[PDB]
Design a binder for this molecule. Sequence first.
Ligand SMILES: O=C(O)c1ccc(O)c(Cl)c1
Ligand SMILES: O=C(O)c1ccc(O)c(Cl)c1
Lengths: 264, 265
Amino acid sequence: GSLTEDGLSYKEKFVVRSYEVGSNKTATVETIANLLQEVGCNHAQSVGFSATTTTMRKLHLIWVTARMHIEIYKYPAWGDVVEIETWCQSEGRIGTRRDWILKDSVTGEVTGRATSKWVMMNQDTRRLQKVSDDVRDEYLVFCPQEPRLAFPEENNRSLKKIPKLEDPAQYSMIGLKPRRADLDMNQHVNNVTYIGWVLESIPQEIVDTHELQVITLDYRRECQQDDVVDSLTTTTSDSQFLHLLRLSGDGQEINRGTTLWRKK
Amino acid sequence: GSLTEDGLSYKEKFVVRSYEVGSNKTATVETIANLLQEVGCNHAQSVGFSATTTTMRKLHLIWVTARMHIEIYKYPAWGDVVEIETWCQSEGRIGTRRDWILKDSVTGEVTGRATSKWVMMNQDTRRLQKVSDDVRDEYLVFCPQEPRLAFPEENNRSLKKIPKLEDPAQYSMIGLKPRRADLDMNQHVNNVTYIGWVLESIPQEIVDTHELQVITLDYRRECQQDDVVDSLTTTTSNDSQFLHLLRLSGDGQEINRGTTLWRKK
Ligand SMILES: O=C(O)c1ccc(O)c(Cl)c1
Ligand SMILES: O=C(O)c1ccc(O)c(Cl)c1
């Protein structure tokens, strides 16, 4: 991987692995989400991050994911090479955004795109915050100053508000628990694990006859290492679904989302 | 990755990823096990498999894992490059073996080694069998003819018989279930998922003060997609050793047994 000529975006190529593909012999959406996080981390390292800036370390602040939105046109097959370009942009004091574009390395065609929203949090208290001028100033040195959007269109799916699923859910997968492989180096549940848990309650017949085209996921609260989660899904329709992840006991919401599937 | 000059082994380099490392900022043993399977798959593809041979496809036969044995001296850090060399060898009619050697790409030092035993099974009936002469002759053209062992030693750990853990277990993790990401392209539970499940019942205090040096795992029966597993561990021992058992949550049918050896950090 390398920063591009202008130093305002980063590109990396990945060869799809045998264990990264599903029943269709193409990369799963969880594999795609892991590659997005990997190229994001390599970009952060290339421009001087630990991921935190110097002012953030002084104030004990961290970036936390608020939303992930991914649209896939074609999933790469086992052995194929996918090139992913990523960049960040400040969104004033709301937070920051990281966008991605995925391409078939051979044809150069766009095979997918993604966008994510990040908010500032005090690492100790876990209290959300607005971004200060100091953090925005140092962030502006590695971001394009004119807007660059993976999802440019006004009123596009990536910004749509997601409603809360009402009981009874049409489908459910209960008692989901993270294992040590689901945790990151800081013992926090990996963001991709929540995508896997959401998809667990999609019925097998849909997975057998459709391919996932779009997923939008809000992250409200973290699942701790000793927590247990229930995954709930209801058909809202192409097939569309509404999703809810909540703690198995008291029902505290941890994520809500929507998926759109197209028939094979 | 590429076959070596003589065409009897395969090498591949991997850059360790951010999500592949654990609390020590080095690759987990599950990451190592996934890289071993990946270089094994790339080797099989480079020598014509599709991982069945022509005679196996005609007779509806497949290779299934019987045992995995891994020893790690040093785990690669995030961003490091690890080079893995792999090769296969026939073991007469018993089955086949795949061995691996892991090296630090910069120093060229050996940082780990692994060996696995595979047995032939009919894909439909699931009945184990001996290797036929046609299959033995077919894969002999891609294997070294003089023995090449990752674990050459006289009475080495890789071949040690593993006993069955007796109840009550000292530690347990109950109700483990595979999710869709734990399945391979044929909807079978990935071999690395069982390693993760074994390790789940090791207490956190051991994980915080020790590093895993050796794991030996026998595979007896598969966990199906709708099965639920219980992971059981008992301390058998500056080094800590454990005995492991994975069994179905309901009737207690054994699916795996193993041992781990941990050295203090
Ligand atoms: O292999 C598959 O089809 C597969 C894998 C993961 C996942 O979450 C889904 Cl919905 C399907
Ligand atoms: O992050 C770790 O320390 C880690 C990860 C996986 C695993 O199985 C164990 Cl025992 C530890």
